A paper describes a structure:
Infection by influenza requires the viral envelope protein HA, which mediates entry of the virus into the appropriate target cells through a series of orchestrated steps. During viral maturation, HA is glycosylated, and it assembles into a homotrimer anchored to the membrane by a transmembrane domain. In addition, each HA protomer is processed by cellular proteases to form HA1 and HA2 subunits, which remain associated through noncovalent interactions and a disulfide bond. Subsequently, the pH of the endosome is acidified, which triggers the loop to helix transition in the “stem loop” region of HA2, resulting in a large conformational change from the “neutral pH structure” to the “low pH structure” of HA.
To understand the structural basis for fusion inhibition and give guidance into future efforts to optimize this class of compounds, we determined the crystal structure of CBS1117 bound to H5 HA (A/Vietnam/1203/04 [H5N1]) at 2.20 Å resolution. For this analysis, crystals of the trimeric extracellular domain of H5 HA were soaked in a cryosolution containing 5 mM CBS1117, as described in the Materials and Methods section. Analysis of the resulting electron density maps revealed three CBS1117-binding sites at symmetric locations on the H5 HA trimer. CBS1117 binds near the HA fusion peptide (residues 1–20 of HA2, shown in red) with a closest heavy atom approach of <5 Å but relatively distant from the HA stem loop (residues 59–74 of HA2, shown in blue) with a closest heavy atom approach of >17 Å. CBS1117 binds to the HA surface at a site between the HA1 and HA2 subunits of a single protomer with the compound forming contacts with HA1 residues H38, Q40, and T325 and HA2 residues W21, I45, and T49. Specific types of intermolecular interactions include hydrophobic (residues HA1-H38, HA1-Q40, HA2-W21, and HA2-I45) and polar interactions between the chlorine atoms of CBS1117 and side chains of residues HA1-T325 and HA2-T49. Thus, the compound appears to stabilize the prefusion HA conformation by bridging interactions between the HA1 and HA2 subunits with very little structural change in the side chain conformations of the HA binding pocket (RMSD value of 0.26 Å between apo and compound bound HA for all atoms of 32 residues that are in closest proximity to the binding site). HA1-H38 has recently been proposed by our laboratories to be part of a pH trigger through its interaction with HA1-H18 and relatively close proximity to the fusion peptide, and thus, the close proximity of the CBS1117-binding site to the histidine pair may disrupt the triggering event and subsequent membrane fusion. HA1-H38 interacts directly with CBS1117 via hydrophobic interactions and presumably the loss of this interaction at this position results in reduced binding of the compound. Moreover, the presence of a glycosyl group at HA1 position 38 may be expected to further diminish compound binding and potency in group 2 HA due to steric hindrance.
Numbering used by the authors:
A (entry chain C), B (entry chain E): 10 to 331
C (entry chain A): 10 to 329
D (entry chain F): 1 to 142
E (entry chain B), F (entry chain D): 1 to 174
The structure:
Amino acid sequence: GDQICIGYHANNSTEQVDTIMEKNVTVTHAQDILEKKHNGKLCDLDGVKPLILRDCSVAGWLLGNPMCDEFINVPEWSYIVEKANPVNDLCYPGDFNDYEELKHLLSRINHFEKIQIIPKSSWSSHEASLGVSSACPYQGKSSFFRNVVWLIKKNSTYPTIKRSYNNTNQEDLLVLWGIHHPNDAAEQTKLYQNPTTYISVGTSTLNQRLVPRIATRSKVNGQSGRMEFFWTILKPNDAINFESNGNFIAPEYAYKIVKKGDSTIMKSELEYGNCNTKCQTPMGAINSSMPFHNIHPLTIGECPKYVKSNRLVLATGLRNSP
Amino acid sequence: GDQICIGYHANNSTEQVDTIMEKNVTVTHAQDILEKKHNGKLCDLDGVKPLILRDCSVAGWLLGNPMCDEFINVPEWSYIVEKANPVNDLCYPGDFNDYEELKHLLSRINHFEKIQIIPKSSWSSHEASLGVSSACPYQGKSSFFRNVVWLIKKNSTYPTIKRSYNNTNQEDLLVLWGIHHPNDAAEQTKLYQNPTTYISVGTSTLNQRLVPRIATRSKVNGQSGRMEFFWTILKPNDAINFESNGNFIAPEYAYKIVKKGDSTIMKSELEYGNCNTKCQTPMGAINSSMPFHNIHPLTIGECPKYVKSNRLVLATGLRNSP
Amino acid sequence: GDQICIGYHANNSTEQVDTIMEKNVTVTHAQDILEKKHNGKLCDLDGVKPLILRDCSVAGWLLGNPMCDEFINVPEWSYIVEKANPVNDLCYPGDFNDYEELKHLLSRINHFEKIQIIPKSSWSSHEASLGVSSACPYQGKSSFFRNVVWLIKKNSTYPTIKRSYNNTNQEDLLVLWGIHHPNDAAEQTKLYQNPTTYISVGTSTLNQRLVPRIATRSKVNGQSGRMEFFWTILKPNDAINFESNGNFIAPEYAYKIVKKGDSTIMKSELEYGNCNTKCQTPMGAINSSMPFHNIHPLTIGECPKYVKSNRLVLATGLRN
Amino acid sequence: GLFGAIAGFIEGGWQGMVDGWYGYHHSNEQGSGYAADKESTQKAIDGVTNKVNSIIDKMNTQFEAVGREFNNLERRIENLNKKMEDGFLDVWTYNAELLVLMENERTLDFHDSNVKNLYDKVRLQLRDNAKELGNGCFEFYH
Amino acid sequence: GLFGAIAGFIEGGWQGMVDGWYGYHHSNEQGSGYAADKESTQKAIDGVTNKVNSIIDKMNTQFEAVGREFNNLERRIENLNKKMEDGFLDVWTYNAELLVLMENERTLDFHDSNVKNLYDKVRLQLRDNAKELGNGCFEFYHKCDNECMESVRNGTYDYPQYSEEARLKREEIS
Amino acid sequence: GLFGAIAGFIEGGWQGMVDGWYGYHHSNEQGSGYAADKESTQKAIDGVTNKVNSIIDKMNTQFEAVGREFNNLERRIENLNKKMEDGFLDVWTYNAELLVLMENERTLDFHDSNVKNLYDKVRLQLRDNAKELGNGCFEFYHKCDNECMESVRNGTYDYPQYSEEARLKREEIS
Ligand SMILES: CC(C)N1CCC(NC(=O)c2c(Cl)cccc2Cl)CC1
Ligand SMILES: CC(C)N1CCC(NC(=O)c2c(Cl)cccc2Cl)CC1
Ligand SMILES: CC(C)N1CCC(NC(=O)c2c(Cl)cccc2Cl)CC1
Ligand SMILES: *[C@@H]1O[C@H](CO)[C@@H](O)[C@H](O)[C@H]1NC(C)=O
Ligand SMILES: *[C@@H]1O[C@H](CO)[C@@H](O)[C@H](O)[C@H]1NC(C)=O
Ligand SMILES: *[C@@H]1O[C@H](CO)[C@@H](O)[C@H](O)[C@H]1NC(C)=O
Ligand SMILES: *[C@@H]1O[C@H](CO)[C@@H](O)[C@H](O)[C@H]1NC(C)=O
Ligand SMILES: *[C@@H]1O[C@H](CO)[C@@H](O)[C@H](O)[C@H]1NC(C)=O
Ligand SMILES: *[C@@H]1O[C@H](CO)[C@@H](O)[C@H](O)[C@H]1NC(C)=O
Ligand SMILES: *[C@@H]1O[C@H](CO)[C@@H](O)[C@H](O)[C@H]1NC(C)=O
Ligand SMILES: *[C@@H]1O[C@H](CO)[C@@H](O)[C@H](O)[C@H]1NC(C)=O
C-alpha cells in the first residue's frame, strides 16, 4: 500500500543547550547570545583617544610631578586610564584632600585648558625659585611640582601675602594650592622666618584657614616634611582670595573645564592598540552585536549587558537524533 | 442526523495583550493592572495638610529668615514640600553644619512646638537689638534670622557670656546657634572689641570650641562676612552650656519634638490644591485600586507599587476570533 | 475478555504544595527546602571558639577598661559577639575617633597579640601612677584603662615628651592613644602645669596635632572632663613618633595583627553553649542540608541561603 | 496554540455563547441553540482569579524609594544612592513585565487545554454511538 | 490538569501500585495484579531530581547580608545600608517563592503528560487487536496470558501474531 | 517530551528533509521522496524569532556598574559599594540564566506540539481511508499518486472521491 509519514528535521549539529530538567541537549539550531572575545588592548572610543597616564597618578598629572611632563598639556580625551599603583604620584610626600571626590568630578570632564592664574615672576617680596627638593628630581637636579610654587623668605623676611584671582572665563576653573608641614621650629624659621603661620582662602562658598602642623615623621622619598594639597571649583565671575605669612604652596597654573560629557577613570595595566571601538573594558575592547558579554563589569560606550555566565545558548530548532 | 458541537466564547472585545512569542493578541477579557492617571495637585494625606514651604528652604524656616514669617508657627503636617532651588535660604551668606543630616531627622517628624529658651530681652551686658543686615531685609528695613540673636558689644565692651539652658521638657529639643566670621580685624574690633574670640558649647555628649576665621571673601548678598550655624538634640534633663567673648549668634527660639512618624521632604514646584488623598506623588495625587502605577517612584501613603512600564495587561479570557 | 489498564501512584500523603492557580494541593511526594530550626546557642565554628565579650564593648576590651580583665589576653577567635548595649565601655566618658571604621577592620581579624611599645616604668620626668578616676573603679578603688597611661605633672613641672617606637615585627600594629579635655584653666594648671598644650603624632602616613578643648559639660559617670581616643595602623618597618607638653593619654600596649581572615562582630544577648557548628546565627546555630533558612539574615560559616518565607515546598510526586 | 483545539481543529469561537467561556451547540428536531458548560467554565474562573490575586500579592514585598540628600562634596555617595534606587526600580519593573508575559502565554494555553479536554470528555462518552466530523462536532447515530 | 489524563479520563490513582509512579493493572485467566513501568518512572525521577538540583544551584550566588555600623551623624548612609540589604533580601525571597510556584505547576503537568504518553504508547501497540474502554483500560479481542501482557509492558507486542484471531472475535465471522 | 511526538511515537528525525523543520515522506508507485510543510515551519520560525527578540529587549534595562573610589578610612562605604554592585550583577546573571533555561524547555515542547498537530491535521483528513501504523506513517487503503499526496500536504484531500475504493480494500484486509 501507498504511505504518507509525518516527521521532523535532523542534521549534523553538535550545538548543546540546557533546560531545568536536562543538561547538554543536542539541538538542530541554536543562538549563542554571550560575547566571550576581546582584542586585549586600549582603543579610541568612537574616534577619540583616551588619556593614558602610564606611570603617573591623576595627582601626579594635575600638580605636575616633574616625571609627568608628557601630560603638561593634554588634548581632549574619551576616557582616562590609570594603573592600579602608579609610581609617579606625590614626589614630595603628603596628602591630597578630597582626592576621590576630585576623581569623581574628572569622570564628567573630557577637556581642560591649563591657564596661568598667578605668574611665578610676580612674587617680588618672596623667593619663588628656591622651592625645590631632591624628592622631586628632574634630569638629576632637585625640582618641584610644576603647577604650584613653593614660596621662601627673601632677605630673612616673609611679608604677608594678599593675592586674588577673578575667574573672568565662562567656564568653571579647578584651582590647586598647598601647605608645607615642616619637621621642627628651626626648619620653620629657616624657610619662612615667622614662627606662627596660616593660609586663609575665600571664595563665594569657601572659608578656609589652614595652620601648619609640626610633628616628627618617618622619611618618605628622603623627606620628613609633608605637603598637603587642596582644591576648589571657582565658578564664573567668582574670585579666590589668598592670605598667608608662610608655608604657602601657591597656585601658578589652574585648569579651565572646557568640555563636559561621559567619561570614566578605568584601572588597567593594558597597552594602547592604535584601534577604534564603540565599547572598551579594562581587559580589552569588544566588537559584537551579541546582547550579553562576560569580559568585565566596568565598561564604557555602547556595550552588551554584563553577566557572570560561562555559557548562554538559546534553543531555536528541535531536539536532534544522535 | 442529530449533532452536538463543542466550542468556546468569542465577543466584540478589542483588548490586546502580549506574550513572549506574540505581541498584540486580541482576547475576550483582560485586566489592566497599571494606574497611569493623577490629579496634578498637592493634597492632604488622610485629612492632614502638608507643610508647603513655597519659596523658603528648611534652613530659612528653622533659622527664621524674615521672608519666611508665614512659617513662624506651623501646625502638625503629613509631609513637607520644598522647591528644587528655594530663593529664601541663608539671607546672610554662610553654611549650615550637617544640614542634610538635619533634613534626614525632619523626615521622621510631624510636629515641632517652637519655644523661647533665651529671651532677646535677657542680654543686659550686650546689645541684642543691633544685629541686623541689609542682606536680611524685612519691608525695606535691615533685619536678621528671627530664631537666633546676633550679639554686639555694649559701650565698647563684650564681657564673657556664660549661659545655660536645662531641657525640663519630656521631649527632645532641637537647639540652633552660630558664629560670625568677619571680613577683617577692624570689623572684629568694631562689633566685638576683643580681638581673639571663641564659642565653647557643652552638653552630656557635645564638646565644641569654635574660633572665627578672618579672611577676605567675595560679596554674597552684599556681604564678605559669613555666618556658620550649628545644631544639636538636647535630651530631656540634659543641659547646654555656652561660653563666648565674641562672634556668638545665640539661640532665642528652639523646637520641641512633639510628634514623630512617617513623613518625607518631597521636591515639587506645585502649590496646595485643597484636596484629600490616601496616596501623594510630587507630580500629583493617586485615587486607584490598581496594584501598580507609573507616575513617580517617590510616593507617600497607601500607594500602588511603582514600575517604569507604559502598559501592564493580564490575559483573563481566550484568544478572540475576528 | 482479557484487560490491561494504565494508571498512576496514590498514597496516604497529606503533604501540600502551592502553584500560581491553586493553593494547598495534596501530592504523593514533596521536598521541604526551608530550614526553620536552630539550637538557640553560640557555638565554636569548625572547632574554633568565638570571642564572647559578655558585658564589655570592643572599646572596653581594646583600651582595657578595668572591668574587662577577662579579655586582657585573648586566644585566636572564629567570630566576635557583643551585646546591643554593653555596660563596660568608656568608664571615663568621651569619644573613640573612627570607632565604626575600627570595628570594620576587626571583622577581618582572627588574632591580636599584645606588645609593649612604651614601658610604664620609662616615665621618670612625669607621674605615671596618679592617672586614676572614681569613674573607672577596680575592686572599690579608683583605676583607669590598662593599655594606656594618664600622665600627670611631677613636682609642678611637665617637660616635653619625645617617644618613638619602630615596628620591627613582620605584622601591622594597631596603636591606641588619647587626649584629656579638662573642665577649666585651673584644672589644666593643676594636672599639667603648662596652659597651652598639644599632642603631635607622626608615621610615614599620619600627620596629627591634637589640642585640648575647654567647654562646660554635663557630668557623665561623675565627670565633666572627656577622654578622646585615636588609633592608627603602623606598617612593618615604619616608626610612630609622639611629642606632648600635656593632656597625653600615652600608649603602653598596642596589638600585633597576627591572623587575618573571615570573621564578623555579631550582636547577640546569648552566652557560650559548649557546642560545635559549621553555621552560626545571632539567635542560634544551624545543622542542615536544606538549601534555604528563615532564621536570621546575618550568619557566618557554610550556611543555607536566607529568605523571608514561612514555607518553601517543591512538588516531586503527583496530585493525590 | 499548544493543545491544537482553539483556532485549530475547532476553527473559530461563538459570538452566540454569551453566558460561558466553553460549551455546546445542539441541533435536533426541537431546534438549534447554544448552552455553556458550567462545571469547566467555573473551574477556569477559579484558576484565573487565583492567578491574578497570586501575581498582585507576590508584588506586596516590592522596593520603596526614599528621598536622601547629599552636599557638593558627597557626589560619590549621591551617585551610589541614585544607582541603588534606579537598580531596584529596574529589577522590579523587569519582574512585573516578565511575570505578566509568561502568565499571559500560560493562560491562553490553559483555555486551549480546557477546550481539548471538554471535546475528549464527550468523545469518550459517545464512543461508536456517534461519528467524529473533525470540526468539533459529533453526528449522532440516533 | 493540562494533559487530561490524571484525575481526567483516568478517574483516580492506585494505592495498590507501590514500587512505581506510573504503570499497569492486568486481569487475565491466570489472575489480576499491578506492575510499574520502570522506563517512564526512571525518566520522571531523573527529570525531577535534575529540576530540584537546578533550583538549588541557581540560588548558590544569592545575596549575603553583612554587618556595618554607623554613628549618630551617619543616619543617611545607615538608612541607605538598611534599605540596600532589605532590598536584596526581598528580591531573592520573591525569586525563591516564584520559581517554586512556577516549577510546582510544571511538575504536576509533567506527571499528567507522562501518564497520557504511557496510555498512547500502549494504544498504538494494540491498534484494532483491542477495544478502548475510555477509562484507561484496553479489553483484548484475543487471549493475553502473563507472557503476552509483559510484551505490552516492555514495548515489544507482536501485532501480526494475534491480528487474525482478533479479527475473528471482533467482526462477524463471514 | 510533553506532547509525545518528537523522540516519542515518531522515533527519530529525517537527515533527508533539509528545507524544513516539519513535513512529509510519501511512497507510492511513482516512487518515494521528502517534502516540508511550509505553513507550520514558517509559523514556528515567526514564533522563535519573536521569542529571541523578546528575551534580548527585556534585558535592555539591566544594571550598569560604575567605578567609585574610597580612601583607607572609608572602608565601610567601600564595602557597601562593592556589595551593592556585586548584588545587582548576581541578580541580572540569575535573571538571564533562568529566562534562557525556562524558555529553552518551552521551545523544545513548542516543536513537539507543532509535530503532534501536523500529524493530527493529516489523520482528521484521511479518517478510515487509511491505516494508522503508529510510527507517524499512514498506509493508504487506495492508490494515492503524486497529485493525491499534494492534496494531503496542502490540506484539501477529497475524502468522498476515494472512500468507496478504500472501504472495499479495508473490509478485505480487516
Ligand atoms: C462570560 C463570563 C462568565 N466571563 C468569564 C469569567 C469572567 N472573569 C474574568 O475574566 C476575570 C476578570 Cl475580568 C478579572 C479577574 C478574574 C477573572 Cl476570572 C469574565 C467574563
Ligand atoms: C515510588 C517511589 C520510588 N517514587 C519515585 C520517586 C521518589 N522520590 C522523589 O519523589 C524525589 C524526592 Cl522526595 C526528592 C528529590 C528527588 C525525587 Cl525523584 C518517591 C516516589
Ligand atoms: C532553514 C531551516 C531548516 N531552519 C529553520 C529556520 C532557522 N532559524 C533558526 O534556527 C533561528 C536562529 Cl539560528 C536564530 C534566530 C531565530 C531563528 Cl528562528 C534555522 C534553519
Ligand atoms: C556537557 O558536556 C561538556 C563536555 O566537555 C562538559 O563540560 C559538561 O560538564 C557536560 N555536562 C554534563 C551534565 O554532562
Ligand atoms: C633687607 O631688609 C631690611 C629691612 O627689612 C633692610 O634693612 C635691608 O637693607 C635689606 N637688605 C637688602 C640687601 O635688601
Ligand atoms: C500594537 O498595536 C498598537 C495600536 O493599537 C500599536 O501602538 C503598536 O505599534 C502595535 N505593536 C506591534 C508590535 O505590532
Ligand atoms: C569678578 O570680575 C567680574 C567682572 O568680569 C565682576 O562681575 C565680579 O563682581 C568680580 N567678582 C569679585 C568677587 O570681585
Ligand atoms: C537639669 O535640671 C534637673 C532638675 O532640676 C536636674 O535634676 C538635672 O541635673 C539638670 N541637668 C543638668 C545637665 O544639669
Ligand atoms: C490552606 O489555604 C490557606 C489560604 O487559602 C492558607 O492560609 C493555609 O496555608 C492552608 N491551611 C489552612 C488555612 O489551615
Ligand atoms: C622640685 O623642683 C626643684 C628641682 O630642681 C627642687 O626645688 C625640689 O627639690 C624638687 N623636688 C622635690 C621632690 O621637691
Ligand atoms: C626601623 O628600623 C629599621 C632597622 O634599624 C630601619 O631600616 C628602618 O628604616 C626604621 N624605620 C624608620 C621609619 O626609621
